[PDB]
Design a protein around this nucleic acid. Sequence first.
RNA 1: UUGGCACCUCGAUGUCGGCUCAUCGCAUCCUGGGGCUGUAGUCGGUCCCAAGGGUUGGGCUGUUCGCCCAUUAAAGCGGUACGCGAGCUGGGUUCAGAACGUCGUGAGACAGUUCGGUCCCUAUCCGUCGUGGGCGUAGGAAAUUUGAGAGGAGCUGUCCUUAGUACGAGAGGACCGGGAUGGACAUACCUCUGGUGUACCAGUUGUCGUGCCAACGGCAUAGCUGGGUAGCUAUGUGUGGACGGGAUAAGUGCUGAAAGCAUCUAAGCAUGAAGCCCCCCUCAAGAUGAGAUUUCCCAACUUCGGUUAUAAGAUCCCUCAAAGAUGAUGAGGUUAAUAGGUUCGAGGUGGAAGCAUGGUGACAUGUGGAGCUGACGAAUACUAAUCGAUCGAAGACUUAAU
Lengths: 215, 122, 48, 120, 114
Amino acid sequence: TKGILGRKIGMTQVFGENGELIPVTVVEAKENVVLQKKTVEVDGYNAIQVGFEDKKAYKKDAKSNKYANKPAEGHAKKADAAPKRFIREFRNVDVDAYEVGQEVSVDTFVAGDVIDVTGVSKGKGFQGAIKRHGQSRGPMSHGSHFHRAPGSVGMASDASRVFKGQKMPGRMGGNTVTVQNLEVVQVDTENKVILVKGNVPGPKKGLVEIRTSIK
Amino acid sequence: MIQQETRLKVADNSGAREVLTIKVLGGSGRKTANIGDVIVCTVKNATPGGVVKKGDVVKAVIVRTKSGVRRNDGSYIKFDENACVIIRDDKGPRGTRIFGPVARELREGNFMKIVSLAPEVL
Amino acid sequence: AVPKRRTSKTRKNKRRTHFKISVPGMTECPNCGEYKLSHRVCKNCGSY
Amino acid sequence: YRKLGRTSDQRKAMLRDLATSLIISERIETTEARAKEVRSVVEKLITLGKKGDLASRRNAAKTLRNVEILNEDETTQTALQKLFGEIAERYTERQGGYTRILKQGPRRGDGAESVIIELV
Amino acid sequence: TNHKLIEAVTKSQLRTDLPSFRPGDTLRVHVRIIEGTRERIQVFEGVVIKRRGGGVSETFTVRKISSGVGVERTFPLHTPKIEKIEVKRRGKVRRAKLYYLRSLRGKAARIQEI
RNA sequence: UUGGCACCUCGAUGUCGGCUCAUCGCAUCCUGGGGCUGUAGUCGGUCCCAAGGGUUGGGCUGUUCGCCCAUUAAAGCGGUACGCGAGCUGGGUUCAGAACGUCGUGAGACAGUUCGGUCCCUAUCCGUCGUGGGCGUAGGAAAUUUGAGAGGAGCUGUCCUUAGUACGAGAGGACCGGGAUGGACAUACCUCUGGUGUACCAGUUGUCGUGCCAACGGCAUAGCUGGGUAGCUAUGUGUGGACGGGAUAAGUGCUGAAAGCAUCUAAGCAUGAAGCCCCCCUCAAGAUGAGAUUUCCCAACUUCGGUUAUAAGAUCCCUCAAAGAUGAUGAGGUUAAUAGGUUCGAGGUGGAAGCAUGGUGACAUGUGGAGCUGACGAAUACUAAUCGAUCGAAGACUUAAU
């Protein structure tokens, strides 16, 4: 139950009972609609899909993504809706609720719900082994020429190859990751925000997936 | 942050003036300590007389780190030196004349005797 | 450090199949002149 | 901001000598990255000229080099006097802009994107 | 509207009771301490060393010398566990961060009035 | 392991330890489950099952080793060219110097000491870590997904209750349960604490310059010094391991013959572990078996050979960053807020210049939270995202239902 889409606004803090400071990630979970209901009788699995942030309609000479194209008009026309930038399926929800076209508002969560927040990472670029992985660097003095290299990559001639999973350098990367068992502390209905306790992955104005905890 | 081989002032009349840490007891691999953490330590500068003497290996609790502790209300506390009280392996001290301010965060570590023998606790 | 084997004529030509070059902008200058590079102002033989 | 392949002082000295010469001749030919960066320099320096008070006269001389223009009828004004006197009178109604960048072809020795930056 | 959301959501938890001070000023912070017994209030008189970044995360820092041992103490400015702040004495400083007092002890760490 | 043998390598298979990075066995060091006990309890002992995960920091020695101080739930044992030097050090040792002991008439020698003593390589292929292009997936597109599979995770202490109960003469002291918290680790993030912050602010030394005063400017590591936004960051904040299902190991049984009995097994039927399979987290239709859903697009010329154009859709190009080596990715491209500028902020610095007053002065005070402010926020078309160009489908047969 209880999935929603938003985007990271930033990070603040809130005081609670007996003055306890608790860190807070403001998520603007605005203008989410139920956009297609999926059934096991048609697809094999039960889910809805929620479109998050509406963008401008079809324009003939459109050269960028903020004007929808003709497949995204007709897809968001089968629901009485505007075309959305982000579209995600939620299959933990109950499919027998959520009529197609429902504005799934921000007051589906109450202060104190446990949730999972899914987002991409920041993305750091090409990084080395002691930054991409938590590797111990070599000594910076005493004659050494090994500082921030990876170490040995194998054994000599039994295993005359490098095994995969070696943890070599490359792209640190914005990949999807969930932080689990976060709390909702404050739902502002008029501002359409959620204050989730802690930090969620991604940069600012990113995209989150707040759904309830499977644990 | 108090690790192995940090010199700490000794904050009572247990017989020691300076002490250096051997290990931070607790778990395995435990690197640092703050207020309320018991450390095992050898005294380096000792008062002539008293109880402990130079080269004894004593257990002792951290009071008032220089990199102090954070509280639940988002409050902080920091001190100008690292100090230390030699204890007597039941969370009770050796001396009766504990010097200097003690952080509040060792009331909940059952060091109530160290609090009562101290000046104003903050 | 050194190549253990020579590369053949076949393996060399498979490597440099992406060693190419692209055709440039080539937009007409509607006032006067020949083709200008796209989004550029002309200098010679054109009125952009 | 861009580093332009130079040190913090080599970039600073390059960027205020390139902004002074775009006050002298009012259109100069540079590379594309060096014109993206002197764009924000000279537009912040015409903003000081539209003020015209003594406090920002002192601030435009932080940047401008001591270059003397030979004007018509053999009269000589400095680049500080020409900034508050001629450019400041041209753009006293306009709320921004003050420059444009017209791209050109690559150079011969490099593939450096030539650019005319003008003063509009 | 991005920009109001940091402000308009955390606005109802910011305070208004607090006086106006700056670094150099002597304060009497009336922090309240709640153990399992009662809601006792302890006063912390010190000199403001630091006031940093704004919002509901405004944070000040006062400095006291207790038993020959200097004590830094740092509060969120809008926390509901400061019952009262009194400005005891003003101070003539010329910095915003008074970190040089950490190495000055005794009469050398003296800050004038007004 | 010490050897034995002399098979590979002397037109070179180059170095003992240590470091970095590991990986694999189980004859198990800790944690899991059992049997027996000369097991009261608490502790143990011994044996069996089990590799999931974990398995410290110092002192001395070049040391492997070993001793020792501290800890720890435990500080496992081995294999991988006594793992790993085209990854690193070079202390150890086979180099030239020199010295002692000893031996030799001697030159010298020892495998005895002692001091000193150059560590080459731009990665072709395989392999690995990332990342694009091509083509295929029987129309072409846009979007959401299924998961065949693969990978990651997996550790554990302490305390409180049960309960001073069971047990015990006492001393002591439980299982089972419940709860609290940690350590180590792995992640995400910059709100806090901090770090950095070389186009931010201020102070200040020397010298040169802007005619001079005053204000500035250059150089002196950014001249130094005090701070500091954005961003990146941990030592800072957050979470995580869990449960819970199946099937089992050792074991424990029930029923039950064969063999009138007995019998855990033969037929049956149970129960039983950090293990196994899920559960959890990622990645995944190049999953050539190329999956599925939703939406969009629909051509004629024409030995239809192909061409001409094009659809939906893209792309070139241009403005950019939440992205990045590149390119990809994402935000935009005038019906435009994409970037700059401008305007207003936020935060930062701490009171600008000029003027006035006071002081003989150095300087103070007022004007005035003043000026200034790189990346942050909002507004604004002022400037630039021009005109353009390129690519892109026409839906094959076969049979079966209809």
